Amino acid sequence: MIHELLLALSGYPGSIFTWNKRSGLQVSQDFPFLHPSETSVLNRLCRLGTDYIRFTEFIEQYTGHGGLHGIYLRAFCTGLDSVLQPYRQALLDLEQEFLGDPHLSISHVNYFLDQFQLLFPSVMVVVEQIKSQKIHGCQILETVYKHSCGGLPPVRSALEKILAVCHGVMYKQLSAWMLHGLLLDQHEEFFIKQGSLKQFSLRVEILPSYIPVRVAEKILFVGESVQMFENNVNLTSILKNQEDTFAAELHRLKQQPLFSLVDFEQVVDRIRSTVAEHLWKLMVEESDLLGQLKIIKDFYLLGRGELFQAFIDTAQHMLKTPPTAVTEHDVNVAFQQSAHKVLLDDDNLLPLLHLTIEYHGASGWAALGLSYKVQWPLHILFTPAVLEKYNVVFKYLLSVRRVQAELQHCWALQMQRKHLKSNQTDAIKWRLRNHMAFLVDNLQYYLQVDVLESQFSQLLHQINSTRDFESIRLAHDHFLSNLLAQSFILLKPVFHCLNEILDLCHSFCSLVSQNLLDERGAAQLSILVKGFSRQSSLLFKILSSVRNHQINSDLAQLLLRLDYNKYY
């Protein structure tokens, strides 16, 4: 009987301990020479060997080799296999004992194997959850971990050992990602996923729950930062052979028998800092971030005022109409001729700037944008969405500049001999023109000084008084976001008041040109002058807001009136 029992416990059903697929190992309940309590022991040993067989089957199926698969499974199986080994040893020990003592009793076998009878079925619950729910990849880690929390020193301990082996796969994936920007994750088991350039994100539904999202964000950041080294005419590691110091901290951790979150986070924090510091360096000290911001400000934020004025004047005739196939080309020449006209030297910046025209997919001005060809490594700051935003600011700025130019041109045209009347309308034109130019020069002064310069200023300060890249992204996002809010809240109503002044200007021009102290003439004349005066006063009121960086009632009601006109 002991022979058939030792065999069964080793994985070999026969004709006495038989195998039911449904229920596993069974024995007859009717041996006439067994006491009921011995049959009972045999029944309990049957469970013990039924688990052993079911483990072994599981292990064989997912090592060596849509249901279970992946490397986290394999490592789970490997850890299980290791956790079963003392049991195997016990069988080998029992087998020697039986050889030296053919009176080995059922009772003795049962007592010797007691520890395994306690251990096995906890561990089998883990196998079973895995099996029924198809637990995959890093989710296996969460399962083993939670049940590792289900106490009883030897089951907790078995499960810890399994976790550690499983964590071995994580540390491997981690250190490939964090230290070499690679994602070796054929089966989609890891909590960083992919999804030319390559995008990355968190797969949070697979993130082990004892690892906070906050910690995973950092791992995400480190690995992106690294993989973003795809420099073809040079070759610059953002680590150093600080690489090895880090390879070793991960290998160390991989060796811990117990998972420590504080410890793991310290290592993650330390790699992140370092990548952040080297990133700031790369940008500010070796790729002239400060210098490209300036270029961006010169172009997107019209900092080169004289070039855009020349540009608007030369391109007006080609942009006031709906674009055509040649517009973009014509407009870029006009833009290059304007830089020449204005003695713009730096022979090497205009190549890197191009004006775009939306053609196919109402006026050329509406279709116009600006595109900047960022270079490695700066595109990690100047992402395409960032440049999209600049570009929207650009169009609000350019619009205000253009309605100013047209206003200036409207007065100029009227000051020409053919429009002069040699009486009092002349001196009125003259006063209005000079007032409008005073107005506009002050709009531009405060728009530029209290808005652009001063925001740009803070940006540079923030950038200079930190050594962390993420502090730069942060300050930059605040800067760009404020520019957009000012475009919608200041530029737009400024543009609308100036454009109103412009209609009044054309109206004035057209009234004078009718060659009427006629009754209706002096009437019209006065309506027009109150127009200019009211628009002028409003712009001045708008300018305090510009100064306070708070919206005042005048600005608020004007924004309200403008939404009311659009909708009602």
Nearest of 334, 428, 418, 322 to residue 367 by alpha carbon = 322
Residues in the chain: 568
- Classified as helix, coil or strand, 357 is strand
Residues 173 and 36 in one domain: yes
CA dist., res. 512 & res. 344, Å (int):
41
Longest CA–CA separation in the chain, Å = 138
Helix locations, 366-491, DSSP H: 384-414, 424-446, 454-464, 469-486
> Which helix (H) or strand (E) is 78 found in, with range?
helix 71-83
Residues 451 and 503 in one domain: yes
Contact yes or no for 80/54 (Cβ under 8 A): no
Chain centroid to Cα 565, Å, comes to 38
Please measure the distance between the N-terminal and C-terminal CA atoms of the chain and give it in whole angstroms: 96
- For tokens 């964090």, what's the residue? 178
Contact yes or no for 226/272 (Cβ under 8 A): no
Q: Quick check: bond before 121 cis, omega within 30? A: no
- Classified as helix, coil or strand, 300 is coil
- Resolution in Å equals 2.3
> Which helix (H) or strand (E) is 194 found in, with range?
strand 192-194
CA dist., res. 294 & res. 459, Å (int):
11
CA dist., res. 167 & res. 181, Å (int):
19
Per DSSP, 350 falls in state: G
- Of 288, 312, 345, the last residue of a domain is 288
Residues 456 and 367 in one domain: yes
Residues 389 and 456 in one domain: yes
Residues 53 and 176 in one domain: yes
Where are the extended beta strands (E) located within 34-74? none
Question: Two tokens at 148?
Answer: 């590792």
Backbone angles phi, psi at 26, to 5 degrees: -125, 155
CA dist., res. 533 & res. 508, Å (int):
13
Q: Number of folded domains in the chain?
A: 2
- Of 265, 288, 311, the last residue of a domain is 288
* 432, 433, 437, 440 alpha-carbon torsion, rounded to 10°: 60
Contacts within 8 Å (CB) and 24+ apart, 313-317 = 313/405, 314/338, 314/341, 316/405
Chain centroid to Cα 394, Å, comes to 24
Q: Say if residue 184 is exposed, middle or buried (CB neighbours under 10 Å; 0-12, 13-18, 19+).
A: exposed
What is the number of H-type helices and E-type strands within the chain? 21, 6
Contact yes or no for 332/354 (Cβ under 8 A): yes
- What amino acid occupies position 8? A
- Which residues does residue 370 pair with via DSSP β-bridges, in sequence order? 355
CATH number assigned to the domain comprising residue 469: 1.20.120.1900
Residues 221 and 106 in one domain: yes
Per DSSP, 201 falls in state: E
CA dist., res. 411 & res. 260, Å (int):
75
Question: Two tokens at 19?
Answer: 């195998």
Residues 228 and 368 in one domain: no
Q: Say if residue 388 is exposed, middle or buried (CB neighbours under 10 Å; 0-12, 13-18, 19+).
A: exposed
Residues 274 and 165 in one domain: yes
Nearest of 162, 72, 154 to residue 121 by alpha carbon = 154
CA dist., res. 502 & res. 2, Å (int):
108
Residues 40 and 131 in one domain: yes
Nearest of 179, 135, 141, 173 to residue 160 by alpha carbon = 141
Contact yes or no for 112/94 (Cβ under 8 A): yes
Question: Two tokens at 142?
Answer: 């969460």
Where are the extended beta strands (E) located within 18-135? 18-20, 24-26
Domain range for 554 is 289-567
Residues 284 and 294 in one domain: no
- Of 225, 255, 288, the last residue of a domain is 288
- Classified as helix, coil or strand, 66 is coil
- Classified as helix, coil or strand, 173 is helix
User: At a CB cut-off of 8 Å and minimum separation 6, what does 289 contact?
Assistant: 283, 378, 381, 463, 472
Residues 158 and 12 in one domain: yes
- What amino acid occupies position 394? F
Residues 206 and 295 in one domain: no
